[PDB]
Amino acid sequence: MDKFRVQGPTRLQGEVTISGAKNAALPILFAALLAEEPVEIQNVPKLKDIDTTMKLLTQLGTKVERXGSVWIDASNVNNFSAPYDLVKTMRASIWALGPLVARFGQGQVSLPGGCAIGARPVDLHIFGLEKLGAEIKLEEGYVKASVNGRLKGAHIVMDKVSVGATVTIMSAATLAEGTTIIENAAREPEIVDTANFLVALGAKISGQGTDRITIEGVERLGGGVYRVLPDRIETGTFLVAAAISGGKIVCRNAQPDTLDAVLAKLREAGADIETGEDWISLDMHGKRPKAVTVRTAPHPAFPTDMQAQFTLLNLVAEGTGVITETIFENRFMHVPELIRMGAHAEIESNTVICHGVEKLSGAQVMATDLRASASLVLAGCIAEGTTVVDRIYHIDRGYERIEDKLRALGANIERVKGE
Numbered sequence: 001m002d003k004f005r006v007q008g009p010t011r012l013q014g015e016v017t018i019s020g021a022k023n024a025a026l027p028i029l030f031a032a033l034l035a036e037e038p039v040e041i042q043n044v045p046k047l048k049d050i051d052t053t054m055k056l057l058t059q060l061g062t063k064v065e066r067x068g069s070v071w072i073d074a075s076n077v078n079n080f081s082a083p084y085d086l087v088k089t090m091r092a093s094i095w096a097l098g099p100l101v102a103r104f105g106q107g108q109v110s111l112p113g114g115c116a117i118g119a120r121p122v123d124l125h126i127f128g129l130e131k132l133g134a135e136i137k138l139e140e141g142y143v144k145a146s147v148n149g150r151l152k153g154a155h156i157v158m159d160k161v162s163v164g165a166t167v168t169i170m171s172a173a174t175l176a177e178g179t180t181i182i183e184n185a186a187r188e189p190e191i192v193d194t195a196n197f198l199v200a201l202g203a204k205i206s207g208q209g210t211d212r213i214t215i216e217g218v219e220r221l222g223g224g225v226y227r228v229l230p231d232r233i234e235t236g237t238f239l240v241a242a243a244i245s246g247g248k249i250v251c252r253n254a255q256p257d258t259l260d261a262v263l264a265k266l267r268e269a270g271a272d273i274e275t276g277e278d279w280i281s282l283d284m285h286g287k288r289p290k291a292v293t294v295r296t297a298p299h300p301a302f303p304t305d306m307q308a309q310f311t312l313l314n315l316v317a318e319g320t321g322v323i324t325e326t327i328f329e330n331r332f333m334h335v336p337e338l339i340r341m342g343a344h345a346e347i348e349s350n351t352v353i354c355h356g357v358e359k360l361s362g363a364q365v366m367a368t369d370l371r372a373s374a375s376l377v378l379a380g381c382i383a384e385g386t387t388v389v390d391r392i393y394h395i396d397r398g399y400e401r402i403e404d405k406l407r408a409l410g411a412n413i414e415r416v417k418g419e
């Protein structure tokens with residue numbers, strides 16, 4: 001089992017080129033199940049989640065090739081199920097459900113089980129599909145959807161703001177008879193990206209990026225070429241890496257407008273930030289960060305995917321920082337790991353109260369979250385001594401060659417193979 005050996009402290013300096021969004025590439029890859037013609041998805045990151053998605057697609061009879069792009073040919077889909085073993089390694093597998101029933105009249109996906117970060121049911125996905133006319137049953141742990149003929153457009157109001165259910169409903173709606181309105185839709189940049197992808201295929205969608213999405217169903221979707229937007233979380237993670245190390249970095253292939261909350265919080269922490277059309281620069285001028293207060297919430301508020309990273313920032317900042325999580329209530333596993341490295345903090349309900357320290361110390365820590373756990377690697381970069389991060393497969397699922405990118409910034413990091 002892979003592990004990272006990080007030697008600190010290091011001041012991160014240099015350039016990093018941002019990869020395509022894991023979170024846009026995923027739903028777009030699933031939506032390609034709707035395409036009758038070949039599709040080329042550009043700017044797809046090289047990471048474990050993409051591997052699992054490619055595997056799932058192949059299991060359905062989809063022809064898949066990849067490099068920077070992923071080429072998809074779904075003209076011969078011949079299988080309609082996502083098995084337990086696959087869903088267990090990637091909850092997003094649920095996204096195969098909607099496209100399958102919308103195009104083929106049937107789809108089966110293993111029902112996701114428990115997860116360490118909190119309760120993550122998929123009730124809204126199921127509810128949405130039902131509203132569209134699909135019949136759904138649970139058999140042997142498999143959510144089985146079906147419809148005789150086309151789905152039917154419906155006016156659906158969402159009980160929660162949900163990135164995943166908004167994608168499920170939006171995607172399936174593109175082939176339904178009539179008009180579908182998704183009220184209280186998630187507004188994430190990835191939702192806009194997926195909608196734009198659909199439209200490039202011939203779908204009729206408007207309102208993407210707002211709380212109300214309208215879809216007018218069409219008979220078929222064709223093919224085309226589409227470039228995935230930049231990864232906002234990868235960008236935020238690198239920006240934080242510089243901000244906590246007294247460093248200076250420039251992020252290339254970036255999309256500043258997807259990061260307003262994070263940028264503003266970085267400025268509050270004392271960062272000198274400049275932005276261009278496709279770039280973001282950050283200079284700490286060798287200063288320790290100032291503690292900030294953060295509240296996660298749906299886009300365009302501060303994202304839960306940046307939460308652990310900012311918790312780290314607060315932990316080495318001057319002052320008492322407070323972080324409140326409103327999306328994933330139990331997403332605090334990183335805290336006790338950081339405390340093993342010398343940090344000080346208390347968790348009260350969904351809020352962590354941080355007491356910044358001057359320096360962290362190297363220690364053995366454990367990764368458990370595909371986005372949050374990158375925080376441990378960052379911590380290792382600025383801590384005194386050697387930090388060993390176990391179970392880095394988690395990080396591999398969410399970041400493209402993070403050690404390579406960090407190394408190019410001056411980090412002392414080694415991938416240690418257990419085999």
Ligand SMILES: C=C(O[C@H]1[C@H](O)[C@@H](CO)O[C@H](OP(=O)(O)OP(=O)(O)OC[C@H]2O[C@@H](n3ccc(=O)[nH]c3=O)[C@H](O)[C@@H]2O)[C@@H]1NC(C)=O)C(=O)O
Binds near residue numbers: 120125
């Ligand atoms: C952790 C990841 O990123 C996450 C990111 O943290 C969240 C929030 O921004 O949005 C995506 O998850 P998601 O689609 O499961 O999350 P959402 O559906 O918005 O969930 C928001 C809240 O609603 C709840 N929820 C969601 C769907 C549903 O049917 N029922 C329900 O109760 C969740 O339990 C959570 O409390 C990302 N995943 C992907 C593949 O796009 C990851 O990379 O795997």
